[PDB]
Enzyme design. Structure first.
Site, PDB file in Angstrom:
ATOM      1  N   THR A 129       0.855  -1.178   0.000  1.00 18.42           N
ATOM      2  CA  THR A 129       0.000   0.000   0.000  1.00 18.42           C
ATOM      3  C   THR A 129       0.891   1.228   0.000  1.00 18.42           C
ATOM      4  O   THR A 129       1.748   1.372   0.877  1.00 18.42           O
ATOM      5  CB  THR A 129      -0.923   0.022   1.215  1.00 18.42           C
ATOM      6  OG1 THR A 129      -0.135   0.071   2.408  1.00 18.42           O
ATOM      7  CG2 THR A 129      -1.768  -1.222   1.253  1.00 18.42           C
ATOM      8  N   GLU A 158       3.883   8.062  -1.487  1.00 22.24           N
ATOM      9  CA  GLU A 158       5.299   7.821  -1.266  1.00 22.24           C
ATOM     10  C   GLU A 158       6.114   8.142  -2.509  1.00 22.24           C
ATOM     11  O   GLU A 158       5.675   7.943  -3.643  1.00 22.24           O
ATOM     12  CB  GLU A 158       5.531   6.372  -0.848  1.00 22.24           C
ATOM     13  CG  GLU A 158       5.447   6.130   0.650  1.00 22.24           C
ATOM     14  CD  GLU A 158       4.025   6.161   1.170  1.00 22.24           C
ATOM     15  OE1 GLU A 158       3.790   6.783   2.225  1.00 22.24           O
ATOM     16  OE2 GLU A 158       3.138   5.575   0.519  1.00 22.24           O
ATOM     17  N   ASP A 177      -3.899   4.455  -3.642  1.00 23.30           N
ATOM     18  CA  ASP A 177      -5.165   5.102  -3.317  1.00 23.30           C
ATOM     19  C   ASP A 177      -5.208   6.455  -4.020  1.00 23.30           C
ATOM     20  O   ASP A 177      -4.460   7.372  -3.667  1.00 23.30           O
ATOM     21  CB  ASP A 177      -5.317   5.250  -1.805  1.00 23.30           C
ATOM     22  CG  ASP A 177      -6.673   5.783  -1.401  1.00 23.30           C
ATOM     23  OD1 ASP A 177      -7.651   5.016  -1.469  1.00 23.30           O
ATOM     24  OD2 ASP A 177      -6.765   6.966  -1.017  1.00 23.30           O
ATOM     25  N   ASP A 226      -6.762  -3.052  12.614  1.00 22.27           N
ATOM     26  CA  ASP A 226      -6.039  -4.285  12.361  1.00 22.27           C
ATOM     27  C   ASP A 226      -6.151  -5.268  13.511  1.00 22.27           C
ATOM     28  O   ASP A 226      -6.291  -6.472  13.279  1.00 22.27           O
ATOM     29  CB  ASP A 226      -4.574  -3.980  12.089  1.00 22.27           C
ATOM     30  CG  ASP A 226      -3.901  -5.068  11.310  1.00 22.27           C
ATOM     31  OD1 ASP A 226      -2.714  -4.916  10.966  1.00 22.27           O
ATOM     32  OD2 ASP A 226      -4.573  -6.081  11.037  1.00 22.27           O
TER      33      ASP A 226
HETATM   34  O1  LIG Z   1      -4.521   7.157   3.304  1.00 25.18           O
HETATM   35  C1  LIG Z   1      -3.611   6.435   3.736  1.00 25.18           C
HETATM   36  C2  LIG Z   1      -3.278   6.248   5.112  1.00 25.18           C
HETATM   37  C3  LIG Z   1      -2.264   5.435   5.450  1.00 25.18           C
HETATM   38  N1  LIG Z   1      -1.519   4.761   4.510  1.00 25.18           N
HETATM   39  C4  LIG Z   1      -0.412   3.889   4.936  1.00 25.18           C
HETATM   40  O2  LIG Z   1      -0.042   4.273   6.247  1.00 25.18           O
HETATM   41  C5  LIG Z   1       1.143   5.104   6.192  1.00 25.18           C
HETATM   42  C6  LIG Z   1       0.924   6.369   6.981  1.00 25.18           C
HETATM   43  O3  LIG Z   1       1.063   6.066   8.381  1.00 25.18           O
HETATM   44  P1  LIG Z   1       2.483   5.915   9.055  1.00 25.18           P
HETATM   45  O4  LIG Z   1       3.379   5.295   8.050  1.00 25.18           O
HETATM   46  O5  LIG Z   1       2.946   7.235   9.667  1.00 25.18           O
HETATM   47  O6  LIG Z   1       2.245   4.927  10.257  1.00 25.18           O
HETATM   48  P2  LIG Z   1       0.960   4.006  10.348  1.00 25.18           P
HETATM   49  O7  LIG Z   1      -0.189   5.028  10.516  1.00 25.18           O
HETATM   50  O8  LIG Z   1       0.818   3.133   9.158  1.00 25.18           O
HETATM   51  O9  LIG Z   1       1.171   3.250  11.661  1.00 25.18           O
HETATM   52  C7  LIG Z   1       1.432   5.312   4.710  1.00 25.18           C
HETATM   53  O10 LIG Z   1       2.826   5.437   4.472  1.00 25.18           O
HETATM   54  C8  LIG Z   1       0.849   4.047   4.094  1.00 25.18           C
HETATM   55  O11 LIG Z   1       1.704   2.930   4.300  1.00 25.18           O
HETATM   56  C9  LIG Z   1      -1.780   4.896   3.156  1.00 25.18           C
HETATM   57  O12 LIG Z   1      -1.149   4.310   2.291  1.00 25.18           O
HETATM   58  N2  LIG Z   1      -2.823   5.731   2.849  1.00 25.18           N
END
Ligand SMILES: O=c1ccn([C@@H]2O[C@H](COP(=O)(O)OP(=O)(O)O)[C@@H](O)[C@H]2O)c(=O)[nH]1
Ligand SMILES: CCCCCCCC/C=C\CCCCCCCC(=O)O[C@@H](COC(=O)CCCCCCCCCCCCCCC)COP(=O)([O-])OCC[N+](C)(C)C
Ligand SMILES: CCCCCCCC/C=C\CCCCCCCC(=O)O[C@@H](COC(=O)CCCCCCCCCCCCCCC)COP(=O)([O-])OCC[N+](C)(C)C
Ligand SMILES: O=c1ccn([C@@H]2O[C@H](COP(=O)(O)OP(=O)(O)O)[C@@H](O)[C@H]2O)c(=O)[nH]1
Ligand SMILES: [Mg+2]
Ligand SMILES: [Mg+2]
Ligand SMILES: [Mg+2]
Ligand SMILES: [Mg+2]
Lengths: 627, 627
Positions: free
Chosen positions: B44, B48, B91, B301
């Site tokens: 996902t 990025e 997304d 999760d």
């Molecule tokens: O709209 C969203 C929200 C979250 N993410 C995923 O969640 C991360 C953002 O959260 P973070 O990495 O800070 O930590 P997490 O919230 O996953 O614990 C992103 O890099 C993705 O891997 C995403 O892809 N889209």
């Protein structure tokens, strides 16, 4: 005539201060000889029902009929209605209640259909309906309004403006002042609010004041309406606001109008000499990151007040004419009540700070030296009241705690767990009020706020019971001082209300106000401050707004606690003292001293405002006697 | 071949759990003999950059190359890549970074142009790109990525899904599970996060675990990446999170996986036996006013975890395989760091409450009686840690205050005004943190939060200095107990880290974590709770959400204060005591007793988790020895 037989319509499509060069005209100017209007009435309605507008409009035509029936007057007579115009600005076609449109069109004020949203690829900023009606309403029942046209009804030159979108009222008034008022150039413009019924002769009484040339702004009393047979007073929330209105109008208006500056002309009913407010006043009223420049919009109306007093090379003054009044309604449930007072607290506070920060502008105006000195003293006294109202919270809790602890200590019987229980109730109620204010909304949780006000009420009952109890025991045997001070302030209130000749509020609707005072200190304040202001530039203002909001709350809370710590010896200062002697007692002399000080000051404030009331009434009596 | 020479595209236009009956197919099923996929990898990515995806994808193909190079295996061999598929769900077309699209199309993963937003008056829910690439990246520089295609590179069956709108990740996973996974029916599905580089053999190590049939879920270690030459550790905010990750993975994963239930499979890297999670798990994961039903989405999760353990008539378990790891990055500035942890605190807390409220479901599953008992004990212990973490705030302040006051009292020299000053700093910092959290946003005021963490840090330094000072003086002459307890917990930490064979965090990145612990207690908690949830039905949910948020905060604060009042005798209970004897002392025996209790409990927790680590490692060693 034809203009009285038909309603002309037009589509405005320009920034409000452009109407003149934009070649937009009005019927008043199109007659063979232009009609020299003397007076403009502005009514603002947002979503008001037909009944509310009917009340206000009945007050309007009743006043005008009285003026037209005047015989011995240079200004008025049989044709006096010619010099009068009533402009009815409504905001947004979508939000306005068609329930009110039915009445308006019933008057021939409005006809539908001829309102293309845009013309020549140009949207109509707002729509305008021009007519002069001959019919008049004679009675307003609870659900029905009686419209009659006889030989006794009198003409009214109406002018129905309708905007098409949400514009915060700062916009409506613009169209009133920089727009139409620039065209008609009336001497006098009077602002009402829909649902406010002027007194049957309130308007004429208020108008008589502008005989005096220096007068630039004026208002009248505002009375809570009580409906049929005062049936509303039984409610403790309408009654309390009635009492508060009545004391405010008796004391503060008279005292302030003695000096010349009146802090807030009630937007419910006020009047402005047009020539005086032209130029600088409207400019700073409409157009204003730095603190003052980007925040003054929260003191919307009160700014004009300030500047009109301080106009350079000009000596305008403000007056409170007790002989004119307007009767309006007040909220019944606690939620919308809080969402109301959250507006006045911030408005008064910001105007207070802004004015006092710019007091030096007064001496550069055109007033005489004595008047300038008096204005300076009034500003300093007003700033003093802002300072006291800012330390409301700590003062209330501190008085509460000191009294409770002292009585339980003195008698030991059962006031003991009462001390602890009430302290805990105070803490829970204050904390919960914070968080609900900051995060939540009032309307979401009505039930809890109702509970909050009730809890604070019983707290006040307990406080009073302890106060009288100690007074009684001490007299059987600082508390002689407290009974002196409270008896004095109540007596002064009574004598002032009698002098003003409306004492029927001192006993009818007093207890409600006393029991609600805690809610006025610990809930209205908290919610008022917690909602100060309510990438792209927009988010940048938003970040700044949040900064200011969450900085003011910190300063307020910290400073109040500073006082509490210094007096009660909380915050570990008491520990520091005991351990300093090592290298804690219950209560010290500090408590007694401060406790005396707060009541001493309260009696002082009541006495001063009493003197203000006496002087104003005496002056009016003497001028009436000579007149 | 052609499918390796060309990238097929398709437009999905149906609710995710409808793909099968909707007659939508994939290449894996269209071969002459269907390819029996063994494993699905889900990546996902939201916005990025190309580098982050490159890191993750390098980890991917390196793992697959290793599996294809395996010789002695029934499952893998020369053609092992056939049984593998990598699904890349992004997304929203608008938000995805085209900077990453350049790399994707560089692989032949994506070609633009053939993407009509809608077809036959039907919008395409999402776009899908099908290809199997033969080129592989060999190096990832700081700004450049090296793509090479030689005889050593290996095929990869990619499948690029692209949605077109903001969908919170709960939606993405739906398409992964109820969609494609239903078609391909892989045995094993593994979830990554973009920017997470699996270890070069992490995937194979993790896969080896699913030899054991009962295993339903598993994960690996998560390591903060340190970049070039550990240059990031010098920062005290990356270093502290490194240490926290490392202790968490060493202690809690091993102890919990001993029993069978692992609280949170790191969404950075986890793996699920598909058959096990089918049916009930996905249903409660995707579709859920009553509290649990309308709130569980914050524990997104961790719900699956719970249900997979408690599946009726089924005996699935969860395992933590220490031999597999994934290296990811952590936030560098305090704002986005706080906006991260505000997610995990709520997630863990709600899962904790929900699980413990439904523990009785375990006995109705298919596990054996001994396993059921062990699971029950694990749930009770876990709930116990939630209870302790909920009383974090009062525990920290109370320890602080008691220690400070006792030392200043004991020596009187200058620790005196230090007591008062530090108390005031604590009060200001906590209050300001509240209000900034509730009303404001973290990113608006970074500077203040940086100040907040620093102030709490110096507070910790002072606390430590006093602790060692009293220990030294007492030993020269409960504090023997505190030195025993802290020496014990540090020693246990060290010995556990050595046993796990990664001690290079115990000394490199320990001091940062110790100095940040106050910020982990008094700032992350406060902001976590203050943002629980972040007319029409929508406003009705909103009102309910605000209700829950502003109720939880009240309970939390009140209860913590209840403890503080009972121990320190604040809240006037101390007054009630003194005046009861009338019918206050500084500190009582309560302080000493509680002070001992908190450290006693901390040593207990460290010891227990140490035993958990020892047992898990021993079992893995013995099974390896037999194997
Ligand atoms: O709209 C969203 C929200 C979250 N993410 C995923 O969640 C991360 C953002 O959260 P973070 O990495 O800070 O930590 P997490 O919230 O996953 O614990 C992103 O890099 C993705 O891997 C995403 O892809 N889209
Ligand atoms: C200092 C100035 C701070 C200004 C900051 C803030 C302004 C508001 C101050 C409120 C009154 C504080 C009174 C005080 O001195 O502190 C009390 C304790 O310590 C506390 O209780 C500290 C509370 C800090 C609150 C900060 C905001 C968050 C509130 C929610 C936080 C989470 C809920 C839990 C909070 C603990 C005094 O206790 P004591 O009387 O010394 O006890 C021994 C009495 N004896 C000697 C007789 C045996
Ligand atoms: C009770 C449980 C309440 C739970 C509710 C709330 C939980 C948080 C409690 C914080 C600690 C309170 C400590 C306490 O007992 O109260 C202190 C005073 O009274 C206060 O200071 C009351 C503060 C109430 C705060 C409510 C939220 C709004 C904060 C912002 C409000 C605006 C800012 C101004 C606030 C004043 C104790 O004082 P003391 O030590 O008895 O003083 C004499 C000491 N001597 C005998 C040694 C001479
Ligand atoms: O968009 C708006 C906002 C305010 N008002 C006027 O302000 C009143 C709403 O405020 P309220 O009467 O409660 O007290 P105020 O805010 O005027 O002191 C309305 O009835 C109008 O008189 C309006 O017409 N439109
Ligand atoms: Mg009103
Ligand atoms: Mg109102
Ligand atoms: Mg990440
Ligand atoms: Mg991140």
């Amino acid at each position: 005539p034809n203009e009285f037989k038909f309603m002309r319509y037009q589509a405005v499509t320009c920034e409000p201060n452009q109407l003149a060069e934009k070649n937009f005209t009005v019927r008043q100017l199109k007659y063979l000889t232009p009609r020299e209007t003397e007076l403009m009435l502005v009514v603002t309605m947002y979503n008001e029902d037909h009944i509310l507008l009917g009340r206000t409009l009945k007050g309007i035509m009743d006043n005008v009929k009285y003026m037209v029936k005047k015989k011995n007057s240079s200004t008025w007579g049989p044709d006096a209605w010619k010099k009068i115009v009533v402009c009815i600005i409504s905001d947004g076609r979508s939000k306005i209640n068609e329930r009110s449109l039915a009445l308006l069109s019933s008057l021939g004020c409005y006809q539908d259909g001829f309102a293309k949203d845009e013309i020549n690829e140009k949207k109509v900023a707002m729509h305008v309906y021009e007519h002069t009606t001959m019919i008049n309403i004679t009675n307003i029942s609870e659900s029905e309004v009686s419209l009659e046209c006889n030989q006794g009804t009198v003409p009214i030159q109406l002018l129905f403006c309708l905007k098409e979108q949400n514009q915060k009222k700062i916009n409506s008034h613009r169209w009133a002042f920089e727009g139409f008022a620039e065209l008609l150039r009336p001497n006098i413009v009077t602002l009402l609010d829909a649902g406010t019924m002027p007194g049957k002769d309130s308007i004429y009484q208020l108008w008589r004041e502008f005989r005096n040339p220096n007068v630039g702004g004026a208002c009248g009393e505002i009375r809570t309406d009580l409906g049929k047979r005062f049936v509303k007073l039984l409610n403790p929330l309408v009654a309390s606001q009635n009492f508060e209105y009545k004391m405010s109008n008796i004391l503060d208006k008279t005292t302030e109008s003695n000096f010349g500056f009146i802090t807030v002309l009630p937007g419910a009913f006020s009047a402005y000499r047009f020539e005086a407010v032209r130029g600088q006043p409207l400019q700073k009223y409409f157009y204003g990151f730095h603190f003052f420049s980007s925040n003054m919009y929260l003191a919307e109306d009160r700014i004009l007040c300030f500047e009109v007093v301080t106009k350079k090379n000009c000596n305008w003054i403000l007056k409170y004419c007790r002989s004119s009044y307007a009767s309006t309604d007040v909220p019944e449930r606690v939620p919308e009540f809080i969402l109301q007072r959250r507006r006045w607290l911030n408005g008064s506070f910001f105007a207070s700070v802004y004015s006092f920060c710019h007091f030096y502008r007064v001496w550069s105006s055109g007033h005489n030296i004595g008047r300038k000195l008096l204005l300076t003293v009034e500003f300093f006294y007003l700033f003093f009241n802002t300072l006291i109202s800012w330390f409301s919270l700590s003062s209330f809790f501190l008085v509460f705690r000191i009294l409770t602890v002292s009585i339980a200590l003195a008698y030991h019987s059962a006031f003991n767990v009462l001390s602890v229980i009430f302290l805990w109730l105070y803490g829970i109620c204050t904390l919960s009020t914070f968080i609900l204010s900051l995060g939540n909304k009032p309307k979401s949780t009505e039930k809890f706020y109702v509970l909050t006000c009730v809890i604070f009420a019983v707290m006040m009952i307990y406080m009073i019971f302890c106060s009288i109890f100690m007074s009684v025991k001490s007299f059987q045997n600082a508390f002689r001082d407290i009974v002196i001070s409270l008896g004095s302030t109540y007596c002064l209130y009574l004598i002032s209300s009698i002098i003003y000749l409306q004492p029927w509020h001192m006993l009818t609707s007093f207890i409600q106000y006393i029991l609600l005072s805690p809610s006025y200190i610990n809930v209205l304040n908290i919610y008022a401050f917690c909602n100060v202001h309510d990438p792209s530039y927009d988010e940048k203002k938003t970040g700044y707004y949040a900064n200011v909001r969450s900085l003011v709350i910190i300063f307020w809370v910290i400073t109040n606690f500073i006082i509490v710590a210094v007096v009660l010896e909380t915050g570990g200062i008491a520990d520091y003292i005991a351990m300093k002697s090592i290298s804690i007692p219950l209560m010290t002399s500090k408590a007694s001293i401060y406790f005396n000080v707060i009541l001493w000051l309260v009696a002082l404030s009541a006495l001063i405002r009493f003197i203000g009331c006496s002087i104003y009434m005496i002056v009016r009596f003497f001028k009436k006697v000579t007149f």
